Design brief:
Strand order of the largest sheet of chain D: 1-2
Shape of chain D: extended
CATH topology of chain D: Hypothetical Cytosolic Protein, Chain: A
Distance between the termini of chain C: 11 Å
Radius of gyration of chain C: 8 Å
CATH architecture of chain D: 2-Layer Sandwich
Number of helices of chain C: 2
Structural class of chain C: mainly alpha
Number of strands of chain D: 2
Helix content of chain D: 10-25%
CATH class of chain D: Alpha Beta
Number of domains of chain D: 1
Chains: A alpha+beta, B alpha+beta, C mainly alpha, D alpha+beta, E mainly alpha, F alpha+beta
Order of helices and strands of chain C: HH
Oligomer: part of a larger assembly
Strand content of chain C: under 5%
Distance between the termini of chain D: 41 Å
CATH superfamily of chain D: Ribosomal protein S21
Shape of chain C: flat
Largest interface: A-D, 35 and 27 residues
Strand content of chain D: 15-25%
Chain lengths: 218, 141, 27, 82, 180, 129
RNA sequence: CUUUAAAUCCUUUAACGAGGAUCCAUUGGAGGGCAAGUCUGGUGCCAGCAGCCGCGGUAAUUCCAGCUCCAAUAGCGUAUAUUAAAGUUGCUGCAGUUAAAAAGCUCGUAGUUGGAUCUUCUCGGCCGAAGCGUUUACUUUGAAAAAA
């Protein structure tokens, strides 16, 4: 069973947090993947993007560990990416899945043209960067699919995007930097100020402030 | 930085024309010495007369003997070395017979561990090497 | 998680079969 | 936010920095949300109300969080006009 | 100089990536559901939908009260409605981009023969069509890729000369009965 | 030397907006700069600004509400026909739901939407989103 | 029959024509890139494969074959030229400290770029006409502009 070790985890297991977007609203760090299991565990799907052997030269020889890149997310606007290096492939993949769970960010979706129906593309042109890898996401007409390389295509599909134009510059062969740049571009979708977000912020009580009295007696 | 003025079209166009000559592919395609040095003369295939059979040793990491043929082209009288691809296919080529040779697949560059060989034998004595290899046809008696 | 290909890769991470095992491990 | 029908479709509306009107990212862990206790006019006690100021981590990292919070409090009447 | 004409147009496009599992799986699934001969039929319908979508995007980039936009968009919408791909009420250029290759593969003569109770299976439907057992309104149609219109849906009979509709016994039945 | 004072004004506004400044000083002012700032203000991007009248060339102090992602100039001022406006919108604007291209047309200095509304092309000054 | 100067070919009507419906689908490939076997036999750094990385030195997933599979399919492979990929010619849109790269330095003509600033008239056909009486660029319109 799950025993939380953090205040936020105890609040989550107490059924006092109504949604994961409420945790995102205050940008609180998530350090227990069980929170993501609690909130989106019924819809999350993970995918091992890559396994690569990394070698450290030693006196005896070459010590080889394995680095696992795993992209997780539900196809409704939550995606995360996790990289874990470990001695064995199985535990590397387990840790990568856990890390991808911990890094799940909300994805903002928008409309290329008319605003009929549900959002389908990125709200605006966004860009992610990771060590010479440049990944640009451009809104695309409804029904055009994701025009991207297979790795950013996986990351974008897992994030709930179904129409997107993509551009990549740099050493995109390095799947790790390509995936991290795509994840950064996705994460920037909610950090881009748009004229519909000009409405003044109406602040709400923090999860900790609202429920401190709950643990004041406890 | 590059000039961006509404009246700079001449400068941009002339600079692009000058800087295109620094592109290896463009210079090879347009300066017109590769074509004159090309034994095929721009042709995709060529025909020649097998002068002798040679064995070209493979490169440093690979140990083998590639059975090639010295072929004298008819169109320009140039001597080239053409690779006979499959195993036992050199037994179908003889001395002094017509042979149709194509490129090796890298637009005039050596392919694989064979050094200095950029042509492969496609047909021998009007019957293809593939037909002889698979028994679909036999060399004329 | 499939362990057979993981062990085959862990025996030799850069052997003759490294590419196929790594590709099979991806998906 | 709204589509053609007018229904709000976004997952959530993010917080904006009180000092720069910039969106605070959901993974910006340096950002703060300070509550300043409102005090009754004549006694000087904490009457249960408070003013909330959200400050992004970029402003904190450059040292202007203090000046920004002081300016916000001054504009709210929390800090006397000096 | 010749009186002949040379305007000939390729009806499909091969995919950029030859061997990708997702694309191969989807194309084989489409072939399976709709009983198509090969992948080129899927590529042909995809090319048709792609040209339609390109036209729709072009028209959508113009002004709402543009005579060219209005005329061409009305023509395109009426054409898509007439073949039954679009709903009668979804007559805007934005609903064009929301269509899929399913909407076009559903209108083939193979699919309509199979879904009108004329054939046991979709492959049975193709074999029926290719053997002149099916007629539309009055013409004996023989090409399974026939995209039937909406007013042409209600008239898909079983021919008037086919053994199933015209009553003349076929070669096999005649030969078998003549020895009995 | 200093050419295209509109470029300098827009660059200063962009740098101040990135730095989170609430006011930005622009010098020298001009008719084009003031018209561009008014186009910005009508869309709620910059808010009020004040023209300090020196007896040589004005300065402008612009209040900066934080609403500007990027303000930029296009140099040279390419001629933009009505049919060529969509390509410029695709190239420069981050989305089709917001962002503006500013044009000097015979009817004045105006956003691309207004110029399309008045059926007039012009020369592209810049953009802001 | 029909077609058409005669023909042919389609189309149409007959007769015969399918169970291994023998009325027998091929071309490439199976380590990765990239789809599909570290199954079996042979060869043993040979013969060969391999566009690239690489495989082959006596358990070869890579050669030669058997079987099996998979890619397209009446089509498929190969050579070459060319286009996209190439934001590896970069106007959009590349770079120049150390990866290839800024002239040794300054002057200077052509070139390129250039600060603020300026709100009908000889009267006239249901009361009876100004429609540049200082110029270009630009923008918008109109005319004129082969078909394919």
């Amino acid at each position: 069973e799950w025993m939380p070790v953090t205040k936020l985890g105890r609040l989550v297991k107490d059924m006092k947090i109504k949604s994961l977007e409420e945790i995102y609203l205050f940008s609180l760090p998530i350090k227990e993947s069980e929170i993501i299991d609690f909130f989106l565990g019924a819809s999350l799907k993970d995918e091992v993007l890559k396994i690569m052997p990394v070698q450290k030269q030693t006196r005896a020889g070459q010590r080889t560990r394995f680095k696992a890149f795993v992209a997780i997310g539900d196809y409704n606007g939550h995606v995360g990416l996790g990289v874990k290096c470990s001695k064995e492939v199985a535990t590397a993949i387990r840790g990568a899945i856990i890390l991808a769970k911990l890094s799940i960010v909300p994805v903002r979706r928008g409309y290329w043209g008319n605003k009929i129906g549900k959002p389908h593309t990125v709200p605006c042109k966004v860009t992610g960067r990771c060590g010479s890898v440049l990944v640009r996401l451009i809104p695309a007409p409804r029904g055009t699919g994701i025009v991207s390389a297979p790795v950013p295509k996986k990351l974008l599909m897992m994030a709930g995007i179904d129409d997107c134009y993509t551009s990549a510059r740099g050493c995109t062969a390095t799947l790790g930097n390509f995936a991290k740049a795509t994840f950064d571009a996705i994460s920037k979708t909610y950090s881009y100020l748009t004229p519909d977000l000009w409405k003044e912020t109406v602040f709400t009580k923090s999860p900790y402030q609202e429920f401190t009295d709950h643990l004041v007696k406890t | 930085g590059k000039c961006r003025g509404l009246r700079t079209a001449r400068k941009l166009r002339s600079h692009r024309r000058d800087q295109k000559w620094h592109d290896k592919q463009y210079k090879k395609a347009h300066l017109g010495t590769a074509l004159k040095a090309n034994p095929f003369g721009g042709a995709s295939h060529a025909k020649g007369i097998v002068l002798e059979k040679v064995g070209v040793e493979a490169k440093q990491p690979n140990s083998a003997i590639r059975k090639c043929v010295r072929v004298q082209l008819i169109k320009n009288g140039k001597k080239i070395t053409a690779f006979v691809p499959n195993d036992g296919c050199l037994n179908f080529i003889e001395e002094n017979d017509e042979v149709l040779v194509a490129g090796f697949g890298r637009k005039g560059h050596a392919v694989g561990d064979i050094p200095g060989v950029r042509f492969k034998v496609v047909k021998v004595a009007n019957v293809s090497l593939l037909a002889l290899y698979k028994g679909k046809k036999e060399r004329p008696r | 998680f499939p362990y057979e290909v993981s062990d085959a890769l862990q025996d030799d991470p850069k052997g003759k079969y490294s590419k196929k095992l790594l590709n099979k491990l991806v998906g | 936010m709204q589509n053609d029908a007018g229904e709000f479709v976004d997952l959530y509306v993010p917080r904006k920095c009180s000092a720069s009107n910039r969106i605070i990212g959901a993974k910006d862990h340096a950002s703060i949300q300070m509550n300043v206790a409102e005090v009754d006019k004549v006694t000087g006690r904490f009457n249960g109300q408070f003013k909330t100021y959200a400050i992004c981590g970029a402003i904190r990292r450059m040292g202007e969080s203090d000046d920004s919070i002081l300016r916000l409090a001054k504009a709210d009447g929390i800090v006397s006009k000096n | 100089p010749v009186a002949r004409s040379w305007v000939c147009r390729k009806t499909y496009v091969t995919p950029r990536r030859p061997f990708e599992k997702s694309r191969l799986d989807q194309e084989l699934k489409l072939i399976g559901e709709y009983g198509l001969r090969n992948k080129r039929e899927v590529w042909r319908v995809k090319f048709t939908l792609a040209k339609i979508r390109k036209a729709a995007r072009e028209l959508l980039t113009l002004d709402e009260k543009d005579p060219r936009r209005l005329f061409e968009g009305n023509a395109l919408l009426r054409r898509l409605v007439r073949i039954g791909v679009l709903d009668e009420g979804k007559m805007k250029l934005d609903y064009i981009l929301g269509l899929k290759i399913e909407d076009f593969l559903e209108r083939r003569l193979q699919t309509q023969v199979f879904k009108l109770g004329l054939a046991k299976s979709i492959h049975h439907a193709r074999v029926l069509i290719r053997q002149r057992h099916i007629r539309v309104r009055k013409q004996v149609v023989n090409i399974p890729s026939f995209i039937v219109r909406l007013d042409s849906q209600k008239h898909i009979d079983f021919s008037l000369r086919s053994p199933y509709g015209g009553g003349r016994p076929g070669r096999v039945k005649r030969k078998n009965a003549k020895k009995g | 030397v200093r050419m295209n004072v509109l470029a300098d004004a827009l660059k200063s506004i962009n740098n101040a907006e990135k730095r989170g400044k609430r006011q930005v000083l622009i010098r020298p002012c001009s008719k084009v700069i003031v018209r561009f700032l008014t186009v910005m203000m009508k869309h709620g991007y910059i808010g009020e600004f004040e023209i300090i009248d020196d007896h040589r060339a004005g300065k402008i102090v612009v209040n900066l509400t934080g609403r500007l992602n990027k303000c930029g100039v296009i140099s040279p001022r390419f001629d933009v026909q009505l049919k060529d406006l969509e390509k410029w919108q695709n190239n420069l604007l981050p989305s089709r739901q917001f962002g503006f291209i500013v044009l000097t047309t015979s009817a004045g200095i105006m956003d691309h939407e207004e110029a399309r509304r008045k059926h007039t092309g012009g020369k592209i000054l810049g953009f802001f989103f």
